[PDB]
Amino acid sequence: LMNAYENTQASESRIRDTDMAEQMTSFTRYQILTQAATSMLAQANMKSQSVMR
Amino acid sequence: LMNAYENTQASESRIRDTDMAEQMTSFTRYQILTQAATSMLAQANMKSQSVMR
Amino acid sequence: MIINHNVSAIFAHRTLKSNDANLSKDIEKLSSGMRINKAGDDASGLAVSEKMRTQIA
Amino acid sequence: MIINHNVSAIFAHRTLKSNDANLSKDIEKLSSGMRINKAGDDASGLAVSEKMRTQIA
Hints:
The structure is cut from a larger assembly and holds 4 copies of chain A. Chain A starts with a helix and ends in a 6-residue tail after the last helix. Chain A has 2 helices and no strands. Chain A has helices at residues 2-16, 20-47. In chain A, 81% of the residues lie in helices and 0% in strands. Chain B binds chain C through residues 19, 21-22, 25, 29, 32-33, 36, and chain C through 3-6, 9-10, 13, 16-17.
């Protein structure tokens, strides 16, 4: 009984639990993508002022 | 109780709280249009002084 | 240039909308430590995991 | 001078026109973090990429 429980817990971990090392890499991906899409949004705002002159 | 609180708040915040990024876009758009009409409003006043010579 | 509407800001914000949205799901798993926080992310994976947790307990 | 038509302004409008369209796509790619966004950036590159995305999944 103990051996089967230990194996199913290892089996359940793969499907259910997450990798902290893996998800941090993806987490930092969007965080930089967040700032970049934010920075370019401000640039697009400033774009239309150039026609006033 | 805690779970429904988080989900109900999300449903409420979508209809109530405003997206600052999208709102800044319309705000910056309307600001230029105000300077646009003000520039044209000034011109229409100086236009009337042609035949009045 | 067209001043009544600006599509450069339209695409950037919709890009930002999904940039922020997925970042929220990243925090969910990192804080929880469980890869399947809600149903739909892995429907059969969550379902099988519950049957496994049923047996594990 | 022929004041009736502003030929230089016609040329300047088109030269400025293309730069704005070029500028918009540059903002598109910097915001999304990907070089291809819509069908029209690269017909072949999208088709090669999507198969690779199928392989990666």
